[PDB]
Amino acid sequence: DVDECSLGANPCEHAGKCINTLGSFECQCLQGYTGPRCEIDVNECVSNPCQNDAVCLDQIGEFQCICMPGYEGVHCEVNTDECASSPCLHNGRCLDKINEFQCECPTGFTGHLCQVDLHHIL
Amino acid sequence: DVDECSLGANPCEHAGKCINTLGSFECQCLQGYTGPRCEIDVNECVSNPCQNDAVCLDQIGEFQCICMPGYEGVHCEVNTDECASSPCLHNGRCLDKINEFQCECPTGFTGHLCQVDLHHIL
Ligand SMILES: [Ca+2]
Ligand SMILES: [Ca+2]
Ligand SMILES: [Ca+2]
Ligand SMILES: [Ca+2]
Ligand SMILES: [Ca+2]
Ligand SMILES: [Ca+2]
């Protein structure tokens, strides 16, 4: 028959590699493309890869996640540790939250960061 | 017998009013004091008046509450409304919390105050 890969333009879309066969031809697609002639832009978001209510962006051969505040990582799977810098004063114990932290103050101390000393008042 | 209220100093403590009786005397105490001669400073914190883990200060004829952050009022009974100033952008719905608020953003918006527009990206 014909070599469809040697007539002129590439019959394979999205820069796929044209491979001649007897009676037809086949396309070797680039990452992110599918179909007999690489016509389809694969939806990389179709398997729901973005966690914790993240927004999935369907791109060429990849997805990108837009994380909700307090989350990070490729799949937004990481709850950022806000306690990392040890923010609680006066031996307060730090509790990690979503884009926030909580201090558990010892008796006689109050405030978000356990700043307020109350021992002198009592 | 004797007028104990006319000998000299006041037999009633903490500026209580001395009232003579036949065979004794009695004391008419000022607010915050008790006992036959007003000797006792009443503990106004004894009935646990301070709410939401507030610190109770036992004072003369009164208590004062030291509120935990996010609480106010005489008994620290009032959870301050942080949503009062309507902080959420783009028709976000405000949820009141403890010394904090939460914005429930409509689709296409993110961030603590719903600042981030994501509609143009998709
Ligand atoms: Ca052929
Ligand atoms: Ca894609
Ligand atoms: Ca966190
Ligand atoms: Ca008498
Ligand atoms: Ca008292
Ligand atoms: Ca509140």
Side-chain angles (χ1 to χ4, degrees), chain A residues 32-33 40-45 57-63:
Chain A
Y33 303 102
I40 315 164
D41 165 7
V42 177
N43 176 14
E44 282 82 10
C45 297
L57 306 176
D58 172 20
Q59 308 168 339
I60 299 97
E62 67 185 296
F63 64 90

Side-chain angles (χ1 to χ4, degrees), chain B residues 2 4 20-21 23-24:
Chain B
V2 185
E4 294 91 341
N20 189 42
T21 77
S24 193

